[PDB]
């Protein structure tokens with residue numbers, strides 16, 4: 001009785017960021033909740049056709065071919081990580097499709113003249129940069145180093161960090177990059193005497209970077225690392241056959257490094273459009289999962305997928321027209337684009353708004369690894385300039401280290417005897 | 418009928434269409450000669466050309482349409498712009514296709530764990546590192562500095578250079594890297610007494626680097642620059658901080674390094690002709706189309722495709738519906754065995770990478786002149802005397 005409308009999806013179950021493991025049951029939950037309600041789509045039905053993209057553009061290309069050239073006509077695609085998202089979003093203008101990501105954080109995906117029909121619920125990764133500049137200004141650091149991986153997400157984050165950090169009077173003295181092997185840039189960092197290091201790379205690559213860091217002795221009391229807080233909580237103890245450094249050596253190779261992450265979940269206990277608070281959502285998701293939340297990848301991005309499905313459903317209800325969609329005409333797709341561009345509703349992850357800048361969240365969690373575990377050491381709100389410092393960060397010597405130790409004009413005095 | 422998927426920019430609207438339009442006469446000559454001599458006895462080579470305007474969207478659309486609507490293609494041939502080439506090359510393994518490019522020179526494609534089915538007849542731009550190593554050994558320059566722009570291609574070229582020198586006794590004294598303005602970094606290079614500088618930067622940044630070198634007085638009789646040579650001809654006066662006389666005074670004597678278009682021997686190639694005769698017939702075939710640099714590499718690529726299809730049919734079952742893993746593996750193992758003297762030298766593959774000749778060129782008074790070659794198969798560097806010169810009497814020493 002209800003005419004089924006189809007959406008395509010690509011969930012990364014492995015690879016750089018295995019977010020599919022916890023963002024796919026969230027999409028299942030959201031689809032069930034929006035199909036049970038008779039107010040949203042009284043005559044249609046949202047159905048899902050998904051593939052495991054493994055977060056690499058090759059299998060993503062194969063599965064995009066299988067999606068766009070098979071039985072059900074799709075009205076929207078939902079890619080996962082930033083690579084697949086960029087590929088699909090720059091390839092989807094030929095088929096006149098809308099692309100709505102849930103876990104894509106590449107600052108380069110904010111270019112409207114290049115990705116014209118692209119939406120996302122994930123915040124842009126430029127939000128970590130003001131937090132990093134604030135932590136540099138607080139601790140009085142003026143010259144930092146970088147070791148990134150040459151993926152467009154990290155390149156864009158580093159560019160934005162550059163124009164941010166140049167605005168407050170801080171300079172990036174040394175820039176290193178690598179595609180699949182970090183040994184050479186790590187030893188160049190060691191040979192160049194870098195102190196404050198900002199690493200922009202995935203976890204399965206952070207393990208290799210830090211094996212090479214341990215073999216170079218680029219750690220201890222003189223070096224401070226600024227990583228990304230979206231890795232697993234035991235990413236350094238995980239057995240990995242590609243690295244030679246054992247677990248006990250790597251546990252001390254990375255010790256006292258700062259990480260930043262966004263909250264992604266509404267801290268208040270008010271009820272959203274789905275009539276469900278954040279606690280009930282998290283509890284239902286945990287009951288729906290197969291393993292514990294701490295070891296299920298992508299648990300912190302499930303509300304983003306929930307809100308993405310709900311926003312898609314609300315924008316389709318605003319137009320309520322669908323089976324007349326084919327990959328040739330531009331009327332239905334730009335109608336849905338105009339419907340989504342003006343979306344505004346209270347989701348499980350806050351006020352969901354599809355703005356161009358991609359920054360609808362404000363609070364940034366700041367952590368530090370102390371004794372093999374992460375401990376929160378502050379919060380930051382970039383707009384109102386609020387730093388809810390908790391005074392918990394530890395250091396070897398009570399005070400944070402300093403790069404480029406300064407000269408000291410010591411006087412010589414006549415011997416008093 | 419052995420259908421081949423040909424992807425290359427043929428559209429006039431794109432600037433890179435010049436490459437495809439100048440290459441087409443060479444591939445036409447090669448296929449017509451293969452048909453005349455009838456190398457593939459019962460079959461015939463069918464090259465299907467699908468236009469990709471170097472847009473990732475249009476390139477992926479053309480690839481998909483050729484996969485679905487077109488015939489059962491055995492291989493992919495072409496790929497000129499790096500974006501589309503990377504997109505296709507990473508995904509080839511899903512359709513068990515094998516690509517052979519002739520214009521994609523980026524060093525990232527050399528990774529045979531992300532691009533297992535990709536091959537190249539043109540030397541990548543990180544194959545100039547052993548050439549530079551032999552050039553350094555030729556003048557006893559055992560201490561060099563580097564100035565590297567921080568994008569992917571140059572970062573990978575530098576990360577390969579540092580591994581080429583490992584084992585030798587050439588130590589990289591100072592290592593530098595810049596993103597937007599190199600002035601801050603040329604000062605750090607000067608403040609450490611670096612005499613020989615290996616630069617890996619772009620064409621627009623080269624003018625800035627040479628202006629900052631003139632201001633820092635990093636030139637003259639005791640400094641040597643070794644920068645890439647793939648810059649377009651007359652790239653200095655096209656720029657419009659330092660007036661052109663100082664820019665020319667700062668860049669006089671830099672040694673560019675780049676691959677060589679055609680061979681200079683007279684030994685008969687696999688086609689039965691010599692490189693001079695091939696160049697003559699190519700130049701008299703195309704009437705007004707602009708001459709490209711990859712026409713010899715396209716000739717060699719078509720001959721490689723013909724020979725590998727021949728030696729793959731020799732070991733043979735033959736149908737290919739993009740599901741045949743065995744046929745893909747057979748074509749891979751047959752392509753690994755390519756060894757013949759083409760028009761651009763001997764065609765040998767080392768893990769998908771062509772072992773060719775890298776030429777050296779030196780910016781004399783107002784023009785670049787050839788000053789030597791490096792044959793990577795024999796690992797020999799010969800410097801054409803009477804050409805290379807230095808502002809001082811002897812080569813500048815570190």
Ligand SMILES: NC[C@H](CC(=O)O)c1ccc(Cl)cc1
Nearest residue numbers: 081082103105201202228230
């Ligand atoms: N949602 C998290 C996001 C996913 C992505 O950018 O593909 C991410 C960004 C960076 C890292 Cl290191 C790990 C994960």
